[PDB]
């Protein structure tokens, strides 16, 4: 679509960059978290019920979430190095 394809790709790149931004907020919450986990030997690793198991469930939840971030990178990276390469090749061939 010539310039309209580039205009749509700009909005797609903006949405992708916002997904990147949400990804380092996920890693910031993960850090903020991993260090909650922070504790050399003491009392915090016992406490009482519920909330300690909730923290372990949160970090094990992030253990699957951050590797799911890898394939959510890869899913939009499949259309990043191929659609944009074809859009530049189609515009150069028509010109």
């Amino acid at each position: 679509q010539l310039n309209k394809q580039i205009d749509e790709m700009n909005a797609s790149i903006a949405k992708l960059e916002q997904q990147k931004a949400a990804q380092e907020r996920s890693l910031a919450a993960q850090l903020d978290a991993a260090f909650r986990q922070g504790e050399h030997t003491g009392i915090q690793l016992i406490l009482s019920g519920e909330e300690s198991q909730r923290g372990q469930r949160l970090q094990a939840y992030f253990g699957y979430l951050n590797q799911a971030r890898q394939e959510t990178i890869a899913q939009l990276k499949q259309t990043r190095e191929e659609v944009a390469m074809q859009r530049a090749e189609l515009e150069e061939k028509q010109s």
Partner: protein
């Protein structure tokens, strides 16, 4: 059975002719009996409070819907092929995304989740008999041999510390309990023996005039049994004062856990057991202080 009541009506004026001495002897028996009573009530209180508390170590099992959907519900059927586990409650699929967006605070960025690869944990805990050492590690091969899972983790080691700290506390308590019991036995066996040893002349005159073997022991076994009875009764009516002393203090500990805790008092049968034990130990210590003392005056 009242033919000779002279013994029971005779072993009271020895305890009433010196009322301050008998009173403060019953004081020391009650004080030395209060420590094992309060220690036993503390032991039974923390034993009752170790039932709904002191949680079992947690085993985390992954049973996600990426592999299969009906197998995640059906794996409950073959996870009973292993003894020791009594709680097999499994959280539903809404719990995983209902807890993450309500406590982690990052539920606003997961609105565009087209596929959800997030698994669920399993609440599988063993009973109290098979706990500690490598008993948790002996059941690894059977859990790893269970199909329908992708991976499993060993995510706890704090329970080994907890059942080393409680083992040390139990060792200290078991060392101190029999030592307090020995303190009670020795304070009965000494606190009455000097009472018979105070009145040697009654033994000498009652033996020197022609009596029988039991008539010498008649006003002394009852005196020792009554002294132990008075000490045990005073200990029971003094331990409840300290129970109501700590009754207000344990209340603030209840609401910081969200529950409500109460004090388990001494029951009727164990109070009668304490009275009978103290009376028989007083009787034995009065017999052993007199039939040994009867052989002195027969050369």
């Amino acid at each position: 059975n009242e033919q000779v009541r002279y013994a029971f009506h005779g072993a009271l004026q020895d305890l009433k002719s010196k009322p301050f001495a008998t009173f403060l002897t019953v004081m020391v028996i009650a004080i030395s009996l209060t420590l094992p009573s309060v220690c036993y009530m503390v032991y039974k209180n923390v034993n009752q409070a170790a039932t709904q508390y002191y949680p079992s170590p947690q085993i985390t099992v992954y049973l996600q819907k990426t592999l299969d959907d009906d197998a995640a519900a059906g794996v409950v059927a073959q996870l009973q092929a292993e003894q020791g586990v009594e709680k097999v409650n499994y959280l539903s699929r809404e719990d995983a995304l209902g807890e993450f967006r309500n406590w982690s605070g990052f539920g606003g960025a997961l609105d565009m989740l087209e596929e959800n690869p997030l698994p669920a944990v399993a609440v599988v805990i063993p009973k109290l008999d098979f706990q500690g050492t490598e008993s948790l590690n002996t059941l690894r091969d059977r859990i790893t041999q269970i199909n329908g899972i992708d991976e499993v983790r060993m995510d706890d080691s704090w329970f080994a510390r907890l059942a080393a700290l409680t083992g040390l506390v139990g060792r200290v308590s078991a060392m101190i309990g029999v030592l307090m019991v020995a303190a009670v036995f020795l304070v009965i066996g000494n606190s009455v023996r000097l009472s018979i040893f105070a009145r040697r002349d009654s033994i000498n005159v009652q033996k020197l005039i022609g009596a029988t073997d039991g008539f010498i022991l008649r006003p002394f076994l009852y005196g020792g049994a009554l002294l132990g009875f008075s000490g045990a009764l005073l200990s029971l009516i003094l331990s409840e004062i300290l129970v109501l002393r700590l009754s207000s203090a344990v209340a603030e500990v209840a609401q910081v856990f969200g529950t409500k805790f109460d004090i388990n008092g001494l029951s009727f049968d164990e109070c009668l057991l304490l009275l009978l034990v103290c009376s028989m130990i007083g009787w034995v210590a009065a017999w052993l202080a007199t039939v040994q003392h009867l052989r002195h005056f027969t050369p």
